């Protein structure tokens, strides 16, 4: 039953984080009572990797801190050319 | 902008409550421009016949396509579970 809350809350965190151009994809997997989550964010292609890495880490930390029932969280980045 | 939250919740709920579904294994939503593409995988009895699991997956797909706004492509896969 927790998948619905996990996915909404995690998506809402990611979508409004600094440097996120938009969410690319979100995946939730039930493992017993736990939800494993993978999220991939679109980020400016020309950002430095140190900066994109900080963004991914901050999103991960915040989802882990704030979202109940999520066990593992992975946050990946997809570059996008910004018009 | 985004319709992802409604798509995921409504689709998960359709799949979870369908006949022969032991539970949802995973769900994935992808934003493609203004569209959402969805993949869902359901746990089913390991001993269900292929013909039966194909009917279940197709019915879930049809119902999500019919009921869930803003979803474009829908794929429904199955994962077998043998309890005993």
Swiss-Prot record, chain B:
Residues 7-84 are annotated as: C-terminal domain (CTD). Plays a dual, essential role in magnetosome formation; required for magnetosome vesicle formation as well as biomineralization. Probably binds and transports iron. Requires heterodimerization with MamM for stability. This is Magnetosome protein MamB. This bacteria has on average 16 oval magnetosomes of about 81 X 58 nm which contain membrane-bound crystals of magnetite (Fe(3)O(4)). Residues 5-84 are cytoplasmic. Belongs to the cation diffusion facilitator (CDF) transporter (TC 2.A.4) family. The chain holds residues 213 to 292 of 293 of the full protein. It is found in: Magnetosome membrane. The C-terminal domain (CTD) forms a V-shaped, dimeric metallo-chaperone-like fold and binds 1 metal cation (probably Fe in vivo, structure determined with Zn(2+)) per subunit. The CTD is probably responsible for hetero- and homodimerization. The isolated C-terminal domain (approximately 213-293) forms homodimers. Forms heterodimers with MamM. Zn(2+) binds at residues 37, 39, 75.
């Amino acid at each position: 039953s927790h998948m619905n809350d996990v996915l909404v809350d995690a998506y809402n965190i990611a979508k409004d984080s600094q440097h996120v151009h938009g969410v690319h994809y979100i995946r939730g997997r039930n493992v017993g009572e736990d939800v494993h989550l993978a999220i991939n964010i679109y980020v400016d292609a020309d950002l430095k990797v140190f900066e994109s890495d900080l963004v991914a880490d901050a999103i991960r930390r915040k989802i882990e801190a704030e979202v109940d029932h999520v066990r593992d969280v992975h946050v990946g980045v997809t570059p996008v050319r910004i018009a």
